[PDB]
Amino acid sequence: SRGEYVVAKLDDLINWARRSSLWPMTFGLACCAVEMMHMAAPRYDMDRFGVVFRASPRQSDVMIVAGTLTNKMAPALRKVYDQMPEPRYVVSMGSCANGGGYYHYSYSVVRGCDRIVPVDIYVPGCPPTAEALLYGILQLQKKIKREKRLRIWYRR
Amino acid sequence: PTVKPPTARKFIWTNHKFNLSGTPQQYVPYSTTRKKIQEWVPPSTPYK
Amino acid sequence: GVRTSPTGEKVTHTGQVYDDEDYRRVRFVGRQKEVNENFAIDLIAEQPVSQVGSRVISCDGGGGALGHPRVYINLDKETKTGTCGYCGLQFRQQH
Amino acid sequence: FAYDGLKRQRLTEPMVRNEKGLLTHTTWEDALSRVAGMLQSCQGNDVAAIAGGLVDAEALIALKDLLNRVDSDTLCTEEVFPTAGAGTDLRSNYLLNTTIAGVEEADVVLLVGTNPRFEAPLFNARIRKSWLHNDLKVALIGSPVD
Amino acid sequence: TSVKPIFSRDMNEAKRRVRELYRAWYREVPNTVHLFQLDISVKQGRDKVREMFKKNAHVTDPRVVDLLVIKGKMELEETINVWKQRTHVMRFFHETEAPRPKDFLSKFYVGHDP
Amino acid sequence: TYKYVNLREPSMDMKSVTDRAAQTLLWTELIRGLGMTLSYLFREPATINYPFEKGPLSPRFRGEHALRRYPSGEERCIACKLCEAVCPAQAITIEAEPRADGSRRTTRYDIDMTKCIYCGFCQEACPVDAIVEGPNFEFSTETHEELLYNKEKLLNNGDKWEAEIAANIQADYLYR
Amino acid sequence: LHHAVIPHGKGGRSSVSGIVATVFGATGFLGRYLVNHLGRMGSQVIVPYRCEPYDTMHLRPMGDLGQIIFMDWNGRDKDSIRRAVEHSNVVINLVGREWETKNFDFEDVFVKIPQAIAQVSKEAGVEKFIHISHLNADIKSSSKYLRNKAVGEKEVRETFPEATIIKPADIFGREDRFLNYFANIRSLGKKTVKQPVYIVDVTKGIINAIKDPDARGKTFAFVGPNRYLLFDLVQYVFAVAHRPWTTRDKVERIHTTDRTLPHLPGLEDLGVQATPLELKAIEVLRRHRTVQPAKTV
Amino acid sequence: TRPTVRPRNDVAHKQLSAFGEYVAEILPKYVQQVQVSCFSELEICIHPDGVIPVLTFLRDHSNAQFKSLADLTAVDIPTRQNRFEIVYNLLSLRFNSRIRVKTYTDELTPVESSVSVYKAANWYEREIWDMFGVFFANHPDLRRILTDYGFEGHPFRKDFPLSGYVELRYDDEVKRVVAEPVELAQEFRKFDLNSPWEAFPAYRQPPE
Numbered sequence A: 001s002r003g004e005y006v007v008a009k010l011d012d013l014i015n016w017a018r019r020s021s022l023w024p025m026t027f028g029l030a031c032c033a034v035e036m037m038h039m040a041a042p043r044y045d046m047d048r049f050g051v052v053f054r055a056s057p058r059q060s061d062v063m064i065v066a067g068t069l070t071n072k073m074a075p076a077l078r079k080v081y082d083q084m085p086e087p088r089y090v091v092s093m094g095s096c097a098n099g100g101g102y103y104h105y106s107y108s109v110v111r112g113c114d115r116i117v118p119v120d121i122y123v124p125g126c127p128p129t130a131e132a133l134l135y136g137i138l139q140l141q142k143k144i145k146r147e148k149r150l151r152i153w154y155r156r
Numbered sequence B: 001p002t003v004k005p006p007t008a009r010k011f012i013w014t015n016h017k018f019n020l021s022g023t024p025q026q027y028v029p030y031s032t033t034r035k036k037i038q039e040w041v042p043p044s045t046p047y048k
Numbered sequence C: 001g002v003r004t005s006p007t008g009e010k011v012t013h014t015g016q017v018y019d020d021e022d023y024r025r026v027r028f029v030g031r032q033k034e035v036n037e038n039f040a041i042d043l044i045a046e047q048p049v050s051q052v053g054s055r056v057i058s059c060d061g062g063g064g065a066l067g068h069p070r071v072y073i074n075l076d077k078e079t080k081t082g083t084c085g086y087c088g089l090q091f092r093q094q095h
Numbered sequence D: 001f002a003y004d005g006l007k008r009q010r011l012t013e014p015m016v017r018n019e020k021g022l023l024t025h026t027t028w029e030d031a032l033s034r035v036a037g038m039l040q041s042c043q044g045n046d047v048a049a050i051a052g053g054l055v056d057a058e059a060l061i062a063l064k065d066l067l068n069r070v071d072s073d074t075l076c077t078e079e080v081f082p083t084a085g086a087g088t089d090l091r092s093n094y095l096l097n098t099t100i101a102g103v104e105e106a107d108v109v110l111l112v113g114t115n116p117r118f119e120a121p122l123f124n125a126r127i128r129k130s131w132l133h134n135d136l137k138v139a140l141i142g143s144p145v146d
Numbered sequence E: 001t002s003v004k005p006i007f008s009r010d011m012n013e014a015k016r017r018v019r020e021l022y023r024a025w026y027r028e029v030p031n032t033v034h035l036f037q038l039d040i041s042v043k044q045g046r047d048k049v050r051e052m053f054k055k056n057a058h059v060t061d062p063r064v065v066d067l068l069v070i071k072g073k074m075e076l077e078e079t080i081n082v083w084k085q086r087t088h089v090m091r092f093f094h095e096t097e098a099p100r101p102k103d104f105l106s107k108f109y110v111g112h113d114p
Numbered sequence F: 001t002y003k004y005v006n007l008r009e010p011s012m013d014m015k016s017v018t019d020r021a022a023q024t025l026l027w028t029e030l031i032r033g034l035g036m037t038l039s040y041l042f043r044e045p046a047t048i049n050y051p052f053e054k055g056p057l058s059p060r061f062r063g064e065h066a067l068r069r070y071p072s073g074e075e076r077c078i079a080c081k082l083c084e085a086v087c088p089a090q091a092i093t094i095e096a097e098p099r100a101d102g103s104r105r106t107t108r109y110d111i112d113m114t115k116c117i118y119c120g121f122c123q124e125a126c127p128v129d130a131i132v133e134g135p136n137f138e139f140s141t142e143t144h145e146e147l148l149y150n151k152e153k154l155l156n157n158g159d160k161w162e163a164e165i166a167a168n169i170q171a172d173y174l175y176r
Numbered sequence G: 001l002h003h004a005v006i007p008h009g010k011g012g013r014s015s016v017s018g019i020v021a022t023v024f025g026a027t028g029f030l031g032r033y034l035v036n037h038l039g040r041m042g043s044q045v046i047v048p049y050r051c052e053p054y055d056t057m058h059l060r061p062m063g064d065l066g067q068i069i070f071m072d073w074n075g076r077d078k079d080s081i082r083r084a085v086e087h088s089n090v091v092i093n094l095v096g097r098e099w100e101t102k103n104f105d106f107e108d109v110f111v112k113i114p115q116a117i118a119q120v121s122k123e124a125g126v127e128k129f130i131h132i133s134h135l136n137a138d139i140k141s142s143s144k145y146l147r148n149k150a151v152g153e154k155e156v157r158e159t160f161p162e163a164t165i166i167k168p169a170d171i172f173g174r175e176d177r178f179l180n181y182f183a184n185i186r187s188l189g190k191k192t193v194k195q196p197v198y199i200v201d202v203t204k205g206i207i208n209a210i211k212d213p214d215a216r217g218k219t220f221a222f223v224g225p226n227r228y229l230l231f232d233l234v235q236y237v238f239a240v241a242h243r244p245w246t247t248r249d250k251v252e253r254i255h256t257t258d259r260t261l262p263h264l265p266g267l268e269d270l271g272v273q274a275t276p277l278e279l280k281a282i283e284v285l286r287r288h289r290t291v292q293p294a295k296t297v
Numbered sequence H: 001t002r003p004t005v006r007p008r009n010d011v012a013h014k015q016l017s018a019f020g021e022y023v024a025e026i027l028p029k030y031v032q033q034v035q036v037s038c039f040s041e042l043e044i045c046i047h048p049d050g051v052i053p054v055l056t057f058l059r060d061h062s063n064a065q066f067k068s069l070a071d072l073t074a075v076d077i078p079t080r081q082n083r084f085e086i087v088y089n090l091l092s093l094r095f096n097s098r099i100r101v102k103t104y105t106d107e108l109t110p111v112e113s114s115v116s117v118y119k120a121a122n123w124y125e126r127e128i129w130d131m132f133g134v135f136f137a138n139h140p141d142l143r144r145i146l147t148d149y150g151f152e153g154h155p156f157r158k159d160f161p162l163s164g165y166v167e168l169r170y171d172d173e174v175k176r177v178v179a180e181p182v183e184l185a186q187e188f189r190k191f192d193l194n195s196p197w198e199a200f201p202a203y204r205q206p207p208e
């Protein structure tokens, strides 16, 4: 049909523009911040993918939770998540953000940031390398590329 | 590996698969152990 | 050496498979149950028994330091082979 | 080595008889209601209880007080001890009064009607230790067991 | 049995300090309901303050109630100076926690805890 | 054995004062900084073309975990639980039993990859080189429980990456 | 009862509640809070979703790992319904649209899909089935919503004879279309009498209907403790929210009075204290700010 | 014992023993023990009423001049009735030396704050309040420093469990991060590692 073709091409356009202009807000909590900074450093250079370095939280498209989430900061994480405009994504970077990690059995650590915010990409490592984080960001772009917002809207 | 080939084994995958996450072929975890306690099955005949 | 339950589910090399009335099969709906189809119990049976001319044999698994710790296997029983407790290779005195 | 029977043949859920007379799984509410509805219709010797060989003192006094609320004194064990004479009134006529340790202090042990090697194997091991170190004299009235 | 005091020489000075801490919390509850924009009433927050004070009402040691007044002053300073968020104030109201079985029979039904 | 950073007295003759005033009024060090930024403008950047170009790794690299085999197909793991004893984050969960040929083998070998600190104490505690931490670092998932590897997943990582893992161990086993 | 579905733990996130729930329509207003209250017990929750997977992200922190299983389903595909319900011990229906669409009218959403779900849940061996009708459901109703929902209630009752059918009156909450409709309309005042019910009361009633074996085959009516006229209720909405998308079917439903059904059980028969509007309307309408309470009848 | 054994420093042992005698006899009102370890570290174990007079001495005396507070530490030892052991690591830059000043308290006896001697202590003993519950009298702003704001319990006490008593999660009903009792999906596996054989006969305690 014509309408299905039109909403498919518009889905492809808006998914292209969203995955090719991802703006991150990095929670530089712990040691994974150093490796996000290496993913911004000139060897890997996220800025050539259209992924800018340190966009403000009220204009960013993806929240990279890079470090250990403690109990004292989990409401601040959730408040910054609630202040992000949609579509917002969450990359969980490294073991403490993924599942608690080396501080999993601690009294003061949230056992993974997925107890606090919905998470799209889990990037494993302690820390994951800057290349592994850039792999996770390209996998997030591939996840955005196969979104079907207007096709489901046309089929609802 | 054209110059120094890898050592061939009967269990090394002939078909390398890429990252299957987000597909129907992704990894789903489960407990690989069997049942620990055995339950008592009552008899299928009546007790009269 | 994988077989299949009547539910259609592959039994793992441990022997694990969910029951039919077990709800935990729902995790594989639309997805797959990843099993390894190279059973080590079926592959170590395929090895030939090494006929040696000695009474005590040593096994390290091959490769020198890339194998297991070097153990010594007695071969006095002519009824049964002498199996390495690490790698599963088995040995027979040739007399 | 009997701990592997502790994970086989286990009772895990309450069972009641259905309309076909077969045991079927149920809840604790339904099972305790169906037992208590019959227990309220009992009085005196209408209800009795047999204690098994593996029952702790807490469940024993629990079921004793429960049947004493119905005024039932018929509470039994599987193992017969004779009630003639003193019975279970004095403790001394149903105990190992000497001790397990006091076997080390005896000089003649008389064993009547028992195979203590299997009925109480470490009591027999203590008798053997006193046999070996104290030159204990042992006699047995019964079948000539090892 | 001669111990060094924290603030109170006896229990009457201790009750004076308990009383002044309760006065400060009682005054603070409407401001706490307002600026944290809570979903509770001022009366319900004062009920929670009274519940937390009555929870410790069996202590007879002056040093223990001196530490209780010190910790209450610390929680009060964390409430007045807006250092707690809304979540720390609402943790006194165990709202998402399902009510536990209290009698014998429901604890028998749910599991093994006495 | 020590030196004084910033303990210089500037010269007060008219030459040096006029040098400092030409610096102040004519912005000489600001043009120096613009010159250094212009100098990096005309350099070749250090940017590799990921994913087509890859960061250089060593054979010691500690990435994704893999249970290995012998050159007969028999799995190397003989269920000794040294890896989970040494595991600093308690990521390794092991259950074992004698299997049908009487061999000491695991029935559970789980690694929570979100507890794992990727320090490789398991592969150096392992007496038979069964668990290794292989060279894969590109294994990001979309779901948390996809990073909860059981024995099937780890044996499949071994079968997947063994041609590379064996060569890395061949490079580094004389340092171990 | 299977050993993996015996309840364990202390009723928390890592516990096992023994509830395997397939919640159709879980991405809506009721499904949000029902999956939040199921997954906080340690329940296996199958969420069959129609929409974009992004639009299901908020359901993911609601339970422990592996406790929420997302899968695709189509309403006109019985195979996807069987694929979703065949491991569950309870199936909850929450499929609803306030408005009819080009591909789904009120009969597809309220008659065809609930009868399909209940038929497949009967022929898959599911123990418990909960369906959600409306309190004002009637064949002789002026709105097409209430007519098709009464028809669908009748068909659910006749094809799953042990279905717990639940009648909420007008559910108010943070994501409702009852207080948020009146707070964003800025349609008129008539003789309509309503008793709205709070969403957490509805969710606690649904979970108590899951846990109660006496709720099989019952028809509950979830209403609030206070009945209001429509006019002073709308004036209370505008007074709390500090103020001085629709169709004609929604207008017919707002101008339809909430009926009194004393012969049907309610929230008190499931152990639920119905929360009044005066505690929760400030929590709902705090978003709408840039009060004497409404008179009850 | 040359290659693998640590070389013993006898000169520092003799000098720190002489200075420990020096401090023990200048301040006999508070000094309880003086010990020097085999790796030459001096410990002055004092009475807790002499926190200020001893630390003011070592900071200000012309033969001590321990001007730097390296670290301030508590240790929970529950078998002692004074279970908390407060440790003052001090550095003299003039004599290039380190000293340790150790005292004790239980849960209820306050220790005098040493912010008047070392301002560095302002956070350290503040942390000893947060982690151990040791109250410090006349501290300028004594409150918690590391735990969450509603945190009950003093975590580095050894009767406090490893995972706590509560855990957080976001709850979408109340739209808020909430605290619940902790349930672990995998329990922390306690390992009993200690060998049943005596490792160090020099540390053998006399039996009962």
Ligand SMILES: NC(=O)C1=CN([C@@H]2O[C@H](COP(=O)(O)OP(=O)(O)OC[C@H]3O[C@@H](n4cnc5c(N)ncnc54)[C@H](OP(=O)(O)O)[C@@H]3O)[C@@H](O)[C@H]2O)C=CC1
Residues within 6 Å of the ligand: A156, G024, G025, G026, G027, G028, G029, G030, G031, G049, G050, G051, G074, G075, G093, G094, G095, G096, G097, G098, G104, G108, G109, G132, G133, G134, G135, G167, G168, G169, G170, G171, G172, G176, G177, G178
């Ligand atoms: N005040 C109220 O809301 C009241 C509601 N009810 C009933 O309760 C139920 C839930 O209400 P509510 O949360 O407000 O409704 P919503 O509109 O918020 O959500 C209903 C859900 O049904 C799904 N759905 C709708 N149409 C279809 C379809 N054709 N095929 C598949 N899925 C579909 C939607 O999925 P998706 O996100 O993909 O669109 C959504 O998840 C409804 O049945 C409603 O009639 C009863 C009384 C009062």
Ligand code: SF4
Residues within 6 Å of the ligand: A030, A031, A032, A033, A066, A067, A068, A093, A094, A095, A096, A097, A101, A102, A125, A126, A127, A128
């Ligand atoms: S995953 Fe590891 S390196 Fe990363 S922040 Fe956590 S502790 Fe630091």
Ligand code: SF4
Residues within 6 Å of the ligand: F083, F086, F087, F088, F089, F090, F091, F092, F111, F115, F116, F117, F118, F119, F120, F121, F122, F123, F133
């Ligand atoms: S790399 Fe370290 S943390 Fe990871 S499984 Fe091995 S020992 Fe455990």
Ligand code: SF4
Residues within 6 Å of the ligand: F076, F077, F078, F079, F080, F081, F082, F083, F084, F094, F122, F125, F126, F127, F128, F129, F130, F131
């Ligand atoms: S992987 Fe190695 S260390 Fe771990 S149990 Fe197996 S053989 Fe032992």
Ligand SMILES: [Zn+2]
Residues within 6 Å of the ligand: C059, C060, C061, C068, C084, C085, C086, C087, C088, C089
């Ligand atoms: Zn071998």
